[PDB]
Amino acid sequence: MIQLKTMLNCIDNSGAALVECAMVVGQKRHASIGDRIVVVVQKQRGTKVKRGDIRHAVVVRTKQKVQRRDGSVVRFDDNACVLINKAGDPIGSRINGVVGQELRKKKWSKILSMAPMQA
Amino acid sequence: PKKKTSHMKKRHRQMAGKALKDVTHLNRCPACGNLKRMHHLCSTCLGKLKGFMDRNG
Amino acid sequence: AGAHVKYRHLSRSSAHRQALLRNLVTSLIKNETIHTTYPKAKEAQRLAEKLITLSKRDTETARRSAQGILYTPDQLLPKLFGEIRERYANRPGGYTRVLRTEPKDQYSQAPSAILELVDGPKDMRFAMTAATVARDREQKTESTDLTKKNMDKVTRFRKDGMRAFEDMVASLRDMKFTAGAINPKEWKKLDR
Amino acid sequence: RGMGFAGGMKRHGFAGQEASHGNSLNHRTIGSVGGSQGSGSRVLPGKKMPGRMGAQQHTVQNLPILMVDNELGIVVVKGAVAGHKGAVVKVQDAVKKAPPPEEFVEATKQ
Amino acid sequence: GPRPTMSGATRLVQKRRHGFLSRVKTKNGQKTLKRRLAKGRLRLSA
Amino acid sequence: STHPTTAIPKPTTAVLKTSPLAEETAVELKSPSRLQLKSEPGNKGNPKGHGDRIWAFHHIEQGQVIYSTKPVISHQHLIRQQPFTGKNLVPRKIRKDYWRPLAMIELAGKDQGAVGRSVYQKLREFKKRHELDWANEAEEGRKLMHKSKRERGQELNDQKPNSVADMAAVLAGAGKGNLMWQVSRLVKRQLRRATVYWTNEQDKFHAREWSDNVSHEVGIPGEAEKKRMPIRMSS
Amino acid sequence: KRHKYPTARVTRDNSKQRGESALRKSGTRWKLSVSDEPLPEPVPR
RNA sequence: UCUUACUAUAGUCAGGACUAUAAAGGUCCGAACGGGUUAUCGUUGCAAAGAUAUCCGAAGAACUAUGGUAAGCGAGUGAA
RNA sequence: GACAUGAGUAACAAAAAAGAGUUUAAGGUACCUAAAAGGUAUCUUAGAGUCUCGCCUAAAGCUUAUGGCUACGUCAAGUAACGGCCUCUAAGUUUAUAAUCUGAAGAUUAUGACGAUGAGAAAACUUUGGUACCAACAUUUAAAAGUGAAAAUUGUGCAGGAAGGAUAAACCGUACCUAGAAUCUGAAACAAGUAAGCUAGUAGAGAAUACGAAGGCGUGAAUGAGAUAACAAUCAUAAAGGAACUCGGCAAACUAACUACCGUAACUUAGGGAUAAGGAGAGCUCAUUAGUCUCGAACGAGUAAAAAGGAAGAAGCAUGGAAUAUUGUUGUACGACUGUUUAAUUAA
RNA sequence: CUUGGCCGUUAAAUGCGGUCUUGCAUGAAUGAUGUAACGAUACAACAGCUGUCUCUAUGAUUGACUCAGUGAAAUUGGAA
RNA sequence: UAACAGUUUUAUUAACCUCUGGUUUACCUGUUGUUUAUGUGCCUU
Ligand SMILES: [K+]
Ligand SMILES: [Mg+2]
Ligand SMILES: [Mg+2]
Ligand SMILES: [Mg+2]
Ligand SMILES: [Mg+2]
Ligand SMILES: [Mg+2]
Ligand SMILES: [Mg+2]
Ligand SMILES: [Mg+2]
Ligand SMILES: [Mg+2]
Ligand SMILES: [Mg+2]
Ligand SMILES: [Mg+2]
Ligand SMILES: [Mg+2]
Ligand SMILES: [Mg+2]
Ligand SMILES: [Mg+2]
Ligand SMILES: [Mg+2]
Ligand SMILES: [Mg+2]
Ligand SMILES: [Mg+2]
Ligand SMILES: [Mg+2]
Ligand SMILES: [Mg+2]
Ligand SMILES: [Mg+2]
Ligand SMILES: [Mg+2]
Ligand SMILES: [Mg+2]
Ligand SMILES: [Mg+2]
Ligand SMILES: [Mg+2]
Ligand SMILES: [Mg+2]
Ligand SMILES: [Mg+2]
Ligand SMILES: [Mg+2]
Ligand SMILES: [Mg+2]
Ligand SMILES: [Mg+2]
Ligand SMILES: [Mg+2]
Ligand SMILES: [Mg+2]
Ligand SMILES: [Mg+2]
Ligand SMILES: [Mg+2]
Ligand SMILES: [Mg+2]
Ligand SMILES: [Mg+2]
Ligand SMILES: [Mg+2]
Ligand SMILES: [Mg+2]
Ligand SMILES: [Mg+2]
Ligand SMILES: [Mg+2]
Ligand SMILES: [Mg+2]
Ligand SMILES: [Mg+2]
Ligand SMILES: [Mg+2]
Ligand SMILES: [Mg+2]
Ligand SMILES: [Mg+2]
Ligand SMILES: [Mg+2]
Ligand SMILES: [Mg+2]
Ligand SMILES: [Mg+2]
Ligand SMILES: [Zn+2]
């Protein structure tokens, strides 16, 4: 459950390390795995995104428990995302870390193909 | 209050459904025959038996 | 808005309420009878029956659980695991009896009741049933089906039963306890 | 399920008022109950206020049947149903759906 | 509003401030006694 | 913790029946002590003359008693011998117009002070068991348990009659290991001689029976100098 | 006493009159040399 | 006999810490004590100025007690 | 002035708390009994007490003041274990005297008198000016040790710390209450306020914090018994997020105390800043012991001795274990600073 | 006039800080100006923290409600 | 034919606790300080 002012760990090679959620796009309820958000970059890593940039992102794993049809429930130790463009495709080229398997049913194929492991 | 309540309206509030209900759930004690409340013990025989079991036991 | 209450709170705090029930049960096992309010007699009933169940267990956990319910255990534990354990050895539950009575305090007019240990030396239903049978024999009246039903209730699990009952009846008759009683054949003609 | 006397938050979803910023004794209260003289100088009918809640008939529509066991005498329906356990409910074919096939209606009568 | 000005008050100050000798031995005190005597007061002081 | 006794019959070490509950008399519940089997014990580690005389003071209005080793009492005796019996019942000090000597016990031996220090111990211990553990007066005699906490405390202060009875008991051999005995262990034992001086001859009758080793006299040394004449019965 | 210095181990109860009461008839805190004897009964005033 | 100032005679300030001192400081942390910062409650109140928490000073220009002096044409007292 | 209405409504909620037996007196009912009486049971009014539970506790306890519309059998030559009266004086007062000033009233100076919150021989028997002084602070001292007073000794700092007199038992006070349970002030039986001493023990540096032995209390029906809706007050916990709340982080939460621990920036009036910041340690068991202490007989043993002690060990999710001490940092304005103020809406 | 211009801080600055000034209407003991230290003064920012909020929920006590006992008040031209 | 595999989102109203969480003041377990009761309890001849 991501909302305004929530901090997330960006796990793509876009240049961002810590981003703050500014808007939940396409809905009023708090964002979960597979939802689009607008973020503001607060920390970088050392056409990369710099601190203060405003980009769109996709929640790839949350700390709130996410239930599935088969009764299984997944939970991560952090909230993470990957930056995207208004077109919907990723900005980076490689993702380091596990992502939520809920990205499959929300039409995020490109984010999954570059994801090493899914949970 | 904006006005003094009249005699008609205060009597309504005091009497309409505020009558004291008569107690009809009464019966007699099987040991002495005095009037008692239903599903209750006789207060006369209670104290008398309570004292009878205190002297000889 | 929330859930219904599990039990009566009796307008008290958690610690106070617990101590209240322990005192009612401590006084019950000490005197075999207590006269209090009906709501208190009904809350101490569930705790008194659960304490007599511990008396019928053989583990040490039960001996420590009974010690934690009474307030003078060193003085009452021998009676619990002694006289009381032998009394209710063949009775499957229902060791207590609550009987509504008139208000114990007339100031408040609070509904009162008597909590007693069945088959005990101060069983009120055992005595009331004896005074009824004593009146019937002294007045040559036929006992009702409800009197016979109670005669069997207060003599089935008792130690001697009928022998103790007939002795209570004989005592009341010799003491003239039924003197001044109203014959049931004259109840229908009395307006007071 | 009955709820007894319910306030305005539970009975109508009122938001309530603030909690710390100076609010005085009005954290769960309904606030204003209407407009001034220009609106009737009265509380209008249908005004949402505290009151009893629940213990009313409630219908859930379009619930499929997943299991049918005659020995146990149960009919397992998907979703939730109004009331507590042990309460009687009325089950009937959905009104917003087509009736069951004619071959089935006649097979049951047979 | 009124205040509790008699809190901690002592009776040694009452006799010094309003006692009989405080008045018979002064020029203005004699007037007080003579005024209260004319009115018929029993309590002329303290 | 505390352990109260019950008013049951028990044996006595004295030669008399100090109480109606006494079963037997002159019973040896323990072998003789180091000084009991000694013809002349002496004050080994005490001042010269200490123990030859023992004084008893009482409140002439309320009955509170105090035991002393010297001819005078101080504020220590009141703090250390008077327990709390209630509010307004324990005096904050000793008032000279209310406290008077009750009696003085003098032993025949003028250098056997150890005998007196023992008699003093048994007296203070008995008094402690009168103010506390008074099971013999709860339902009998004064019936202190049938009274209010106010009247009860006023009766616990009246220790004068009890104190006189303690003397007749302690001087008769009461107490385990009291030096009023004299065991020869040739085994023959006897009681030591003593003298009790009274300001009021009538006070010596609070004891139902006195031993044969005690002689009674009227007048305590020092009272005649204060112009306090003693009270005699025969006039 | 074996150890006499002030900091020595304290094993005594420093509340001497603990539980003692003349109005409640609590009894004596310890067993005395006159505790197993019947309390002498005087003649009342 | 409230209160402001002054005056006389007295009393009180757990414990710890730093500082040049054993004791030299309108020093430090913090009870008693003395204040009354903030918030809530209360507002026909328990109270015509209270309750709870929080906060400030706490060897000093400190606090407190019993007495005394100064007030009503001109103004007594006033760290105002 | 009487009597209505609101209304038989609010209120009888200091976040201590009650439960079950027993008993005395007087009186009211029912029955036994009709020779009254007495007995049994019950109720009303006014009390008492037992067992259990809880609350207060450097108090809501004990002993005493100021005071008192509570009540009058409260008893003293003096010290131990006592004040007044009486002697002496301070601040001051003075319808005393003298002198002086003054529209009268009066005022002033001196003397006298009066005036405690101070000073007053002896007793467990008794009747000059540092050769100093008895303000503060510190130190030392009744010899087994420790602790708290009294008095004295010595010293320190500047703010430089009274006066006077001497040195055979009268009269007055003495009861009760001390503010959480019937008494003082607050219009009162008010959750406020008021002086002194004592005020168990464990544990601590401590009068902090927690428990609480004794004692008292858990109110004069000025209440009691139920039920546990909304809502209010006072609290407790909380998924994910973490100021998005709001005039404003108001309120709440985080943090916290301790160690003779490590370490600590800019700047600076060189004192500070600073307990900066930021880290480490902690309870239980145990190896080990230079001296002290204990036991046995230099030596041996011992923590049923105080302490020391280690990179030792055990168990648990967790050993600042419960309670007690409310964040850190940064840039400005104003005022140097500690202080003071509109008693009771403004504390700056 | 005015949210003065510029810079920093904010995803967004009528705020805060720095800086330039033609300052309706700054100014030198009605003192001018800059630091250390101090502040329950006022303003702004960061970190942490949290039911302040997203968005409330459950639980506890006391009241609220019912029975018994006692028994007010403001108010009231008269009222179907 | 079988088998296998795939077949919207947002918002809103209401009901409902199977699941995921929150709550748990008479449930179980562990644990600190202190008090009370009961039982027990040192060495040596
Ligand atoms: K003149
Ligand atoms: Mg209630
Ligand atoms: Mg508790
Ligand atoms: Mg229900
Ligand atoms: Mg809300
Ligand atoms: Mg209209
Ligand atoms: Mg209208
Ligand atoms: Mg005024
Ligand atoms: Mg005053
Ligand atoms: Mg007195
Ligand atoms: Mg004054
Ligand atoms: Mg200071
Ligand atoms: Mg509030
Ligand atoms: Mg209000
Ligand atoms: Mg400060
Ligand atoms: Mg401080
Ligand atoms: Mg109304
Ligand atoms: Mg109401
Ligand atoms: Mg009410
Ligand atoms: Mg009667
Ligand atoms: Mg005198
Ligand atoms: Mg004089
Ligand atoms: Mg004086
Ligand atoms: Mg108080
Ligand atoms: Mg009063
Ligand atoms: Mg009061
Ligand atoms: Mg304290
Ligand atoms: Mg009291
Ligand atoms: Mg009570
Ligand atoms: Mg949360
Ligand atoms: Mg969380
Ligand atoms: Mg905002
Ligand atoms: Mg907003
Ligand atoms: Mg705050
Ligand atoms: Mg290790
Ligand atoms: Mg482990
Ligand atoms: Mg200032
Ligand atoms: Mg200041
Ligand atoms: Mg003001
Ligand atoms: Mg002030
Ligand atoms: Mg203010
Ligand atoms: Mg100038
Ligand atoms: Mg009522
Ligand atoms: Mg659920
Ligand atoms: Mg379930
Ligand atoms: Mg649950
Ligand atoms: Mg339990
Ligand atoms: Zn009957």
Numbering used by the authors:
A (entry chain I): 1 to 46, 59 to 131
B (entry chain W): 66 to 122
C (entry chain L): 2 to 193
D (entry chain C): 221 to 330
E (entry chain Y): 95 to 140
F (entry chain d): 33 to 218, 243 to 291
G (entry chain T): 44 to 88
Provide text from the study.
Protein synthesis in mitochondria supports bioenergetics of eukaryotic cells and is executed by dedicated mitoribosomes. To provide a representative reference for studying protein synthesis in the mitochondria of fungi, and to reveal how the mitoribosome functions in coordination with its translation partners, we determined structures of the translating mitoribosome from the representative fungal model organism Neurospora crassa. The fungal mito-ribosome consists of 78 different proteins, 23S and 16S rRNAs.
To further improve the local resolution, focused masked refinements were performed using the masks for the large subunit (mtLSU) core, central protuberance (CP), L1 stalk, uL10m region, the small subunit (mtSSU) head, body and tail. In the CP, we found an extra density in the pocket formed by mL40, uL5m, and rRNA H84-ES3. Based on the density, interactions and the abundance in mitochondria, we conclude that it is most likely to be NAD. Arg295 of mL40 forms π-stacking at the other side of the NAD pyridine. Therefore, NAD bridges the mitoribosomal proteins and the mt-rRNA at the core of CP. By masked refinement on L1 stalk, we improved the density that allowed building its complete model. We identified an additional protein component, namely mL108. The protein mL108 interacts with both the L1 stalk rRNA and the protein uL1m.
